[PDB]
Each structure stands twice: as C-alpha cells, then as structure tokens.
C-alpha cells in the first residue's frame, strides 16, 4: 500500500537492474526532479505515471484557489483590486490585471504614504500558496532591513488579481522611487509555493519596458529561503537607489 503523495513514493527508484545501485540513491538524494524512475520499454513506469497524475490533480487545484479576504485583514494589509472581478476572468485577461480599478487608485491616494523611496507590494498572482506560506519569513525582515540603517519606507499593501506591469501604475500614483512586487509565479507540478520578486526604479506606464525590471525568482524553502531572500531584495533596493537604475540598466 502506498500514498502517492508520501515521502516514500517521492523517494522511489524504479530502475530494475541497476549497474551501481548506491549511485542511484545518491542521484535521487541530489534532486527534486523525477530522476531514477526507470522505464517500461521507452515508456514511464506505472507508479511514476500514477504519481505524476496525482501531483497534476493537486497542482490544478492550487491555480483556482484564493486567499481569504480575512487573512489579508489579519495580516494588517490594505487589500486592493485590479480591474479583474474573479479568478476565471484573471486567467484570460492579462491586460486587466496590469491595471488598478477606479476605487483602487483612490484608496492608494487616500491611505498610503506619498513619495516613498521603496514601495513593497504583495500580490497573489498565479499562486496563492506562494504568498501564504512564505509571508512571515520574507516580509518582516524586508520591512526592518529597508528601515534599519536605511531610508523612507512605504506602507505595504495587497493587490488581488495582480500581474507585474501593475507596479508601473503603482509607482506613478504613489510617486515611488523603487517599487518591489512580491508575486506568485505560475504553479509547478509538485510545487506551488515558488515566489518571485519584480523590482523597478521610478516606473512609467508609457515608457517602462520589462527589461527595466530586476527579477529574483524561485523564493521558497526548496529554493532561496524567504529569510535570506529578504536581505537580497533590501541589498538590490539599496543599489537601485544608488545608481538610479534597475534591470538591464544596472552595473556588474
């Protein structure tokens, strides 16, 4: 008997007559990728196909699912929308996710601090798990590190249904010199808590291209740990204000 979501199922070696079986364990240890599962002819083995299919059913569910509106409230965040109403419309209309709705603009002017040096924005994006799991490890050392021997920090807020070009509008309205977006990148098959940072110096909707952004991706416990990633993003924000550039316009 086997749970396909178990650690034993993940550790399985399916190569049937190994050349060197002690090497096979060390190779399976080194990797999260589905190495060492063997074959039937040129086809996947049955257990490997079954665990693939199980992980896909679970990965499909991480797409649809949404953060509680009260989780954001109990985190002490402003919640604000894009132009998108719901999760079904989010997936088909990227253009609407790159724009704040009319009430979101007015809330940002009402309730957020004007002309910050560094603005931190959190969005669910395409993975709710990415921002739900990682938050308490990334965000408090991010807000401390920008303050502690640093400068004028913005008040952090949540955008529901955000895609990354929305941070150009956020930088324009708030007058922000640096805009940091932490956002859920699209879910992988066995893993859905991967976070990315997108950061841009002094953005403008008319002129800013994607290459002007710096990306820090794969933030999670299987990637770069969210604790030590916060120190990377603080260092990046410091450098961005120093040389007055982001992305491909940065040195070294």
């Amino acid at each position: 008997a086997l749970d396909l979501g178990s650690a034993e199922a993940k550790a399985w070696i399916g190569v049937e007559n190994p050349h060197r079986a002690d090497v096979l364990t060390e190779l399976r240890r080194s990797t999260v990728a589905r190495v060492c599962t063997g074959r039937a002819g040129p086809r996947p083995r049955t257990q490997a196909l079954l665990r693939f299919l199980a992980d896909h059913s679970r990965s499909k569910d991480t797409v649809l699912k949404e953060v509680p509106e009260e989780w954001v409230k109990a985190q002490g965040l402003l919640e604000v929308r894009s132009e998108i109403s719901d999760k079904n419309l989010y997936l088909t209309r990227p253009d609407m996710g790159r724009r704040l709705c009319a009430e979101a603009v007015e809330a940002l002017k009402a309730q957020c601090v004007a002309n910050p040096d560094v603005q931190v924005v959190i969005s669910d994006g395409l993975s709710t798990d990415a921002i739900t799991v990682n938050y308490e490890e990334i965000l408090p050392p991010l807000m401390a590190g920008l303050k502690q021997a640093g400068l004028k920090v913005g008040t952090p807020f949540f955008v529901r249904y955000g895609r990354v070009k929305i941070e150009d509008q956020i930088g324009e309205i708030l007058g922000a010199k640096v805009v940091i977006l932490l956002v859920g990148e699209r879910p992988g098959l066995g893993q859905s808590e991967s976070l990315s940072c997108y950061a841009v110096y002094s953005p403008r909707m008319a002129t800013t291209v994607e290459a002007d952004r710096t990306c820090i991706s794969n933030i999670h416990q299987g990637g770069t740990p969210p604790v030590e990633a916060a120190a990377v993003i603080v260092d990046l924000a410091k450098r961005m204000l120093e040389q007055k550039a982001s992305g491909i316009n940065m040195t070294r």
């Binding site: 990728a33 997936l91 290459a211």
Partner: protein
C-alpha cells in the same frame, strides 16, 4: 487587390491585409484577447478565401509594421532575393499553398522559392492550411544544420537535454544530465536556464555541463539560457562556449521589451566565431512563441501567428543551429486548450521550415491551462511525423523551476522507436559506443544513469 468576398449571399468586407491575416486564423484565445479574431466561422472562412485570392506581392507590400518604423521589418525585407520574388509575386496564396504541397515540388525547388518570401507571406500560407497540410508540407521541407551534431536530416530526431534546478545546484544538474543521456537525449543541446544571470554562476553551470561532455567525449553542445549579454561576457572571460541563446520577438518594440538589440546578435555570431567549441558553422539558438508580442504590447494590431512568422524571418538572418517555439509555455490567455496548442505547434513548425530555419518545438503546457500530459504526447508525435527537428527532454517532463510540463526523456526514445528515427548520426555513434543504443533502440542497460559510474 480585393478585400471582399460573398459567402452564402452575404458580403464579407475587411479593412486591410492585417485584418484578413488575423481573422483567417483558426480560433484561439489570444486572437480574441487581441481583439482581432473572426466574429464567426463564416467570417473566418471568408477571410481565408480573401487571403487565398491575394497575391504574394499584396501581402509582401503590406507588412504589419512599416519598413521605416521597425528594424525587424527592415531585416526581413532586405534579406529577400528579388529575382526569386519576381518569379512568384503574381502567384495567389492559394497557388503558393498548392506549390508547397505538390509532390512535383522538390526540396531544391523550395530552396530558391523561399528566398522570395517574407514572413507575412509565410504566415498567409499557414493560415489556409489544414493540420495535415501543415504536417505534410513541413515534412517535405527539411532544414539541416551542424554544430558538433548534425540536426534535421530526414529519418532523424533530436532532443534538447534541459537539466534545470531551483538553486542551479551542480549535483542536481549533473544527475538530470546522466538521466537524459541514458535515454539518448541531448544531441540538439544540453541547455540550462539559470536562476541567476551572473558570470560566476554561468561559468559554474557551463563547467558542470562540459565536465560531463569532456569526460565521456560526447559529440554535443552546451548552453546556458541567460540573457545573451551575460552569455557573451562569460564566454569572453573564458567559460566554455557552445550554443549562444536569445529569446526573440517579431518587432523592434518586442525586442526592446526583451532588452535585445540587433547588434547583440551580430556580436553573438562574432563571439561564437572566436571562442566557441563548435566544429560546424552554426552556433546560435533562438526560442520563440505565440503570444510574446501581444504580451509586450508590440503586436501593433496583428495576430500572434503573423507575429510569430516574423520571429522566423528575424532568426533566418542569423542562420542559427536550432530554433524552437515554446508552444504552451505562457498559458491559456494566448492558447487555451489541447486543440489550440496542437494547431499552434503545427503552424509554428511549418512556418519555421518554410522560412528555412532549423525548426523544433517545446511541446508543452502550463498547469493553469486546459491541458495535460496526453496533449504533449499527442503533439510530439504529430510534429515528429512532420519532421520536427527536436523536442525538449526532462525527467518525466517536470520542470522543477520553470514550473511547467514538457516532454519526458521517455518521449524522445518512444518517438524514435515508434517511427524508426535515429539520433544525430554523431551522437548515435556515441550512444552505440556507450552501450546505450543498438539499431536505434535503447538497450537493456539504457534508462539508467548509474551506467556512467
């Protein structure tokens, strides 16, 4: 020209060539999102007929972004053989389709004829082709290139090894490489997308790839798929150069989004000529895909199929070793389901072969699209019958880091043994010497990475 036809008693009127090109497309979610799609099936067929009545001249003289405004348009127009063009300029697109598909049209015939084409004309043919038209037409148009392997010989089928990791950990990269070679994957390239665009990190990844290559004397290429500028920097400072990669887009504004100038790609050719460990004359690697120009705000009212053809016209100028579309890599906003992803894959491959580039495909989908692994397996086999130059390989197709599903190592071995196709002849020689392959088929002791130890 006519922008106008009657179908079942109703007049169907179009504004320009751009609108005809857009609406002649098979239904996809990207064209609807762009606002450019047909309103019904009747108007789609009307657009197809209007397109097929237009001449090569009509569509050549109306590129979707103007000559003076776009450096990609200039590159595509200036690369035309005008003698080849003057032979075919008064052909209808109907006649050009029937010429391509004809059994009396040889590989040598198309070799001159394709030099008279522009990307918009290449797109125009694809739009009035059925799925079997796209597959058969592409198959009778082989494109052969050479690095340390030869790719695209009829009767062969290649694969990129894609050993990606969340941390660029060199033991996890190596473990996936040993797995891939044991299934006979890697004759196209061993190609890592890195987490950090960084010379120290790029060189360490490249040292790991070429560690395996030099140990077992493998005839293949290494690549690290960072931005082209950081690749060039790393290779200049003395990291092993194999293939040099760039993602490309079919407009100048799309290239600006990617941070790419044309002179970077010129520099990549010159750096390859000075530095790279490549026996043959082809050393560049591009990736393309439908939706990218639309994402960049850089499609200029044009559909994503016409834009994707312009990628291939751009790519052709630099005579790369390999190009692949990345067909379902982005998600459902541009291609929604199985049917759309298959159709786009067949379109992109046909258009690449017609443009005369070494065209493969990442047969792939995302977890937020209406799609599963059976679609990858449907599409990889259809494209293999079309003479697709290469696909990807990962352990069961699971990218742990780019967060999508491509084809397995298993899948290349399946395709080869199903269709009696071989690897690259140089790489097949190596597989036979390693005891991994006999007569095209995986031996008993294949599929096992512990063989290398």
């Amino acid at each position: 020209m006519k922008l106008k036809t009657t179908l079942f008693g109703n007049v169907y009127q179009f504004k320009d060539v751009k609108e005809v090109l857009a609406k002649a497309n098979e239904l996809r979610s990207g064209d609807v999102l762009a606002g450019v799609a047909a309103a019904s099936s009747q108007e789609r067929v009307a657009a197809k007929q209007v397109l097929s009545e237009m001449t090569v001249a009509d569509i050549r003289n109306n590129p979707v972004i103007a000559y003076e405004d776009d450096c990609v348009t200039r590159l595509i127009q200036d690369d035309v053989n005008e003698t080849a063009y003057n032979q075919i300029k008064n052909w209808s697109i109907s006649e050009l389709r029937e010429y391509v598909l004809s059994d009396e049209t040889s590989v040598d015939d198309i070799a001159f004829t394709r030099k008279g084409l522009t990307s918009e004309v290449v797109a125009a043919v694809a739009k009035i082709c059925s799925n079997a038209d796209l597959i058969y037409g592409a198959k009778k148009m082989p494109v052969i290139k050479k690095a340390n392997t030869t790719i695209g010989i009829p009767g062969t089928f290649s694969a990129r090894l894609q050993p990606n990791d969340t941390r660029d950990d060199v033991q996890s990269i190596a473990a996936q490489i040993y797995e891939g070679l044991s299934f006979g994957v890697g004759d196209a390239v061993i190609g890592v997308n890195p987490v950090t665009d960084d010379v120290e990190n790029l060189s360490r990844v490249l040292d790991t790839i070429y560690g395996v290559i030099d140990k077992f004397n493998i005839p293949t290429q290494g690549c690290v798929l960072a931005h082209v500028t950081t690749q060039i920097e790393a290779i200049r400072r003395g990291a092993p150069g194999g293939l040099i990669f760039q993602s490309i887009c079919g407009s100048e504004k799309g290239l600006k989004e990617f941070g790419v100038e044309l002179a970077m790609l010129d520099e990549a050719r010159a750096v390859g000529a000075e530095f790279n460990r490549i026996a043959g004359e082809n050393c560049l690697y591009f990736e393309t895909g439908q939706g990218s120009a639309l994402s960049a705000g850089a499609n200029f009212g044009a559909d994503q199929v016409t834009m994707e053809a312009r990628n291939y016209g751009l790519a052709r100028h630099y005579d790369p070793f390999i190009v692949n579309t990345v067909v379902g890599f982005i998600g459902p906003e541009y291609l929604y389901n199985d049917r759309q992803i298959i159709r786009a894959g067949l379109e992109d491959h046909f258009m690449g072969k017609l443009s005369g580039i070494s065209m493969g495909c990442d047969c792939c989908y995302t977890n937020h699209a209406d799609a599963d692994q059976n679609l990858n397996e449907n599409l990889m086999i259809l494209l293999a019958t079309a003479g697709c130059n290469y696909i990807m390989g990962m352990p069961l197709g699971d990218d742990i880091m780019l967060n999508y599903q491509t084809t397995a190592f298993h899948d290349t071995a399946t395709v080869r043994q199903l269709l009696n196709l071989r690897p690259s002849p140089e790489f097949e020689r190596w597989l036979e010497s390693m005891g991994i392959m006999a007569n095209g088929r995986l031996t008993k002791r294949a599929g096992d990475p512990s063989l290398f130890f």
